[PDB]
């Protein structure tokens, strides 16, 4: 009856497959114009938040190679106040900047589909054997936030 109302929170997907197609697309060879569909997005503490799995864009030094420089760009002159924009979607602003997309960049994002990763999360439509996550019995089940 839930389908019915529409109303099925969770939709997103985990950051556990977040990280196999992000991998994926490092193992295509993206050119410059994907390489900052990654190297140059940087999620704000609210990004975060709406968008659970952290970021392994890393400010490349382990203390900080130039502060004066400014480490990881987000400010994108294209994006006319991404701030005034959620966070979601200044994460597609910031990338939106890859228009040269290469194709074989584009196929490690769909090479997931079949991934021994992706196949446990995704039932058939590959893999025809019918099998999913046997789940956990551990949960929190926290009261959450009111």
């Not at 203390?63 to 979607?89: H, N, R, W």
């Amino acid at each position: 009856l839930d389908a019915d109302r529409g109303k099925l929170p969770g939709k997103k997907l985990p950051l556990e497959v977040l990280k196999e197609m992000e991998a994926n697309a490092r193992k295509a060879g993206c050119t410059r114009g994907c390489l900052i569909c990654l190297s140059h997005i940087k999620c704000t503490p609210k990004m975060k938040k709406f968008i659970p799995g952290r970021c392994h864009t890393y400010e490349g030094d382990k203390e900080s190679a130039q502060g004066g420089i400014g480490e990881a760009i987000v400010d994108i002159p294209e994006i006319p106040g991404f701030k005034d924009l959620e966070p979601m979607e200044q994460f597609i602003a910031q990338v939106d900047l890859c228009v040269d997309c290469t194709t074989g960049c584009l196929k490690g994002l769909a090479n997931v589909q079949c991934s021994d990763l992706l196949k446990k999360w995704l039932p058939q439509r590959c893999a025809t054997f019918a099998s999913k996550i046997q789940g956990q019995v551990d949960k929190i089940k926290g009261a959450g936030g009111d």
